[PDB]
């Protein structure tokens, strides 16, 4: 009753039978955006259920020796379905989204990944190691797509903040003797109504072990982690031609 | 009487804030043409 779950929205449906309860990201519920915050005039187009249904991006296998990875939002999806479509041909964007994080293994296993939502992800560089060099991250890092990136230094997130306090942020853990997946429902966050699914990733989802993977010799050792995400209350404004970037 | 012979379209308002926007549809209609006009 706490335990099992079913998360359905619009042709796809999610079921777990070892979950950890949902986390609702700062109490919030997402939602379209109101007459009162709203800037741009133009009537927004509101897809439903084309674009507010689960997608499932690729899977990543979980090594005794991994960092960590992470996405951007809403990169990940700037490029997949009639959502990527919409994100490309409006100037305009805002959403939600319901983030189901999965990885079972066995009552043999152990190890615990916390999955984290970081709004304002900002990357940073060693600077050139002696920190002499005021280098930036490339674009293949900043906006990794769909595949996701790998954190080379997990405990301070490839920013300069510790790891530690992550915690802070909505966020859920899958240790493998309790449950199989973690779910955060993220509501719009942005200091503007709408903002470019382009140029701004409004947060950041990562997946860190924070307790390495472990298991005797001889059990499964292929232990993927895949990610599936919903957006919700999807809305696009600033019609135009397609624009990738 | 002996001799008949000898017998501003603006006003301001307080706008204190910018009009808004009412939502409107689509009209697809003759006679009415708000797009013209006749500078």
């Known amino acids: ?245 | 009487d002996p001799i008949a012979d000898m017998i501003s379209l603006t006003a301001l308002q307080v706008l204190p804030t910018a009009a808004n926007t009412e939502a409107s549809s689509h009209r697809l209609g003759t006679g009415v043409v708000p797009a013209l006009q006749a500078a």
């Open chain 1, 1 to 245: 009753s706490d335990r099992v779950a079913q998360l359905t929205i619009g042709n796809s449906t999610i079921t777990t039978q070892e979950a950890a309860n949902i986390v609702i990201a700062y109490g919030e519920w997402p939602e379209y955006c109101p007459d009162t915050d709203a800037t741009a005039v133009d009537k927004p187009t509101r897809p439903d259920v084309s674009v507010n249904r689960f997608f499932t991006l690729d899977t990543k296998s979980w090594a005794k020796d991994s960092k960590g990875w992470y996405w951007k939002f809403p990169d990940v999806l700037t490029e997949v379905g009639v959502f990527g479509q919409n994100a490309q041909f409006h100037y305009l964007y805002r959403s939600g989204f319901c983030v189901h994080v999965q990885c079972n293994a066995s009552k043999f296993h152990q190890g615990a990944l916390l999955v984290a939502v970081l709004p304002e992800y900002v990357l940073g560089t060693i600077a050139g190691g002696t920190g002499n060099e005021n280098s930036h991250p490339p674009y293949a890092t900043t906006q990794p797509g769909q595949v996701g990136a790998v954190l080379t230094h997990p405990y301070v997130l490839d920013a300069g903040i510790p790891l530690s306090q992550l915690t802070v942020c909505p966020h859920q853990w899958i240790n493998l003797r309790t449950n199989n997946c973690a779910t955060i429902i993220v509501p719009y966050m942005n200091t503007v109504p709408f903002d470019s699914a382009l140029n701004h990733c409004n947060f950041g989802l990562l997946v860190i072990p924070v307790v390495p993977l472990d298991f005797n010799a001889g059990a499964t050792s292929e232990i993927p982690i895949t990610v599936t995400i919903a957006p919700m209350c999807a809305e696009f404004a600033g019609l135009r031609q397609a624009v990738k970037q």
